[PDB]
XYZ file of C-alpha atoms in Angstrom:
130
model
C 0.000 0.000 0.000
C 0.974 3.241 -1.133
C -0.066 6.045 1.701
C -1.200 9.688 0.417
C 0.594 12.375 2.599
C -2.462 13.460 4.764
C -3.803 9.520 4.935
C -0.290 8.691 6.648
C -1.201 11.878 8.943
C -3.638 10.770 10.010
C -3.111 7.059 10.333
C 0.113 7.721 12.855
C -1.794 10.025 14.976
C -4.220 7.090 15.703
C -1.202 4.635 16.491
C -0.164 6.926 19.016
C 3.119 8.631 17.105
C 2.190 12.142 17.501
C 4.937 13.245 19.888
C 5.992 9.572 21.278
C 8.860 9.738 22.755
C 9.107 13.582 21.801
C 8.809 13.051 18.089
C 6.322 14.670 16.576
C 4.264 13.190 14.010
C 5.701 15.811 11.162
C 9.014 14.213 11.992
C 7.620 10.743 11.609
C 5.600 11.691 8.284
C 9.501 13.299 6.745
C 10.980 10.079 8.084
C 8.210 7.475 5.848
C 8.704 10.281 2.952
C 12.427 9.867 2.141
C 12.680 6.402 4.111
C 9.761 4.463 1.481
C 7.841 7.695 -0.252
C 4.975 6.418 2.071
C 4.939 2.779 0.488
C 4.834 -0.126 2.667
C 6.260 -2.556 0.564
C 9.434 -0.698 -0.090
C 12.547 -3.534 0.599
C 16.177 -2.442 0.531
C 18.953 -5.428 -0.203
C 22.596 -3.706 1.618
C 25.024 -6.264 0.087
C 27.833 -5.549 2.568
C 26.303 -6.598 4.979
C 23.394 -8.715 3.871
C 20.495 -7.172 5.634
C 17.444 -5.524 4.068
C 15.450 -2.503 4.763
C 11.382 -3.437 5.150
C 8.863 -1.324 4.528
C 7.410 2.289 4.738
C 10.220 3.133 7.655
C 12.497 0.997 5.959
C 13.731 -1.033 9.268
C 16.676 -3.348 9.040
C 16.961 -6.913 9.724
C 20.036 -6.786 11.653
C 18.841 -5.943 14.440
C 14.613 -5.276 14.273
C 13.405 -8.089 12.432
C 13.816 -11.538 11.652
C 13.898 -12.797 7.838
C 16.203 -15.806 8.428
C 18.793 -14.802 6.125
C 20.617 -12.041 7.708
C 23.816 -13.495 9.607
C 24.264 -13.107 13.311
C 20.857 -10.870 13.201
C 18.994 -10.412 16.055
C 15.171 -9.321 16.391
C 14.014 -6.526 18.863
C 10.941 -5.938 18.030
C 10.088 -9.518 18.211
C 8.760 -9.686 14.459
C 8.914 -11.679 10.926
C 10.126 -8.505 8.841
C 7.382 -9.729 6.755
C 5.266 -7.685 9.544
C 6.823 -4.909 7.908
C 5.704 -5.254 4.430
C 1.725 -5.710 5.648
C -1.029 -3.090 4.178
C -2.034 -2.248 8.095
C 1.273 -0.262 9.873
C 0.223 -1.202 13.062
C 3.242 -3.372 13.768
C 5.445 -1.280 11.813
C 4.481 1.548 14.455
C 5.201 -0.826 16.850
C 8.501 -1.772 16.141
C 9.212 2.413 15.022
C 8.134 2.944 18.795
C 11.123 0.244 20.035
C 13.517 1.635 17.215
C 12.971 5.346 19.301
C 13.275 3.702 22.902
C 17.028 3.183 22.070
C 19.640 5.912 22.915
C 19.542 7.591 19.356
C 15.637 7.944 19.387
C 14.765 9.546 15.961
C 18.484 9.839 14.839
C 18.343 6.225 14.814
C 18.087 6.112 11.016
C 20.610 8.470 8.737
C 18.023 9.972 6.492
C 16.115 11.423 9.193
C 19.560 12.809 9.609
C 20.281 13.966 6.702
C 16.746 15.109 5.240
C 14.555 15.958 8.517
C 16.790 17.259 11.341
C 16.572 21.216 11.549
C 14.874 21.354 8.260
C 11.725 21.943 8.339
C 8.941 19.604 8.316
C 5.925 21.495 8.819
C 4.936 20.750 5.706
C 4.186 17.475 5.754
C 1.441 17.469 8.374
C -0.329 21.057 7.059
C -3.965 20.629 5.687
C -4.142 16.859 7.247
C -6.234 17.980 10.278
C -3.693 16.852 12.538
């Protein structure tokens, strides 16, 4: 699934990501922009070190999620990365939340980094009632 801007919006504020763990749901919505472009289903082979990126917050099997195939991997949020590449975010958000409750918090992943952090990102919640 493929989410429209505002649908996303809204969708994360009823999971509980509007300011969880002091991010606020603009920061989540830039993070699912560059991370997937809001698609769910949105996979990411890294061939150095054989993980992959699952969907729309593109979370890596090294350490989140368990595919089976990445060596020495573990699996924090207690998933099947395939969890991560279902229509309903629910577990996605889930497993975002853990991803956050680690030292790093948002910073955790480098595109937030490089596209979201003291830029602004306004934007992507205006006009979505949230």
């Amino acid at each position: 699934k493929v989410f429209e801007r505002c649908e996303l919006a809204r969708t994360l504020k009823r999971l509980g990501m509007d300011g969880y763990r002091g991010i606020s749901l603009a920061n989540w919505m830039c993070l699912a922009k560059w991370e997937s472009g809001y698609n769910t289903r949105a996979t990411n082979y890294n061939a150095g070190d054989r993980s992959t990126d699952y969907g729309i917050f593109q979370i890596n099997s090294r350490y989140w999620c368990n595919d089976g195939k990445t060596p020495g991997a573990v699996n924090a949020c207690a998933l099947s990365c395939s969890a991560l590449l279902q229509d309903n975010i629910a577990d996605a958000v889930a497993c975002a939340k853990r991803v956050v409750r680690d030292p790093q918090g948002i910073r955790a992943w480098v595109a937030w980094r490089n596209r979201c952090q003291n830029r602004d990102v306004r934007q992507y919640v205006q006009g979505c009632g949230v």
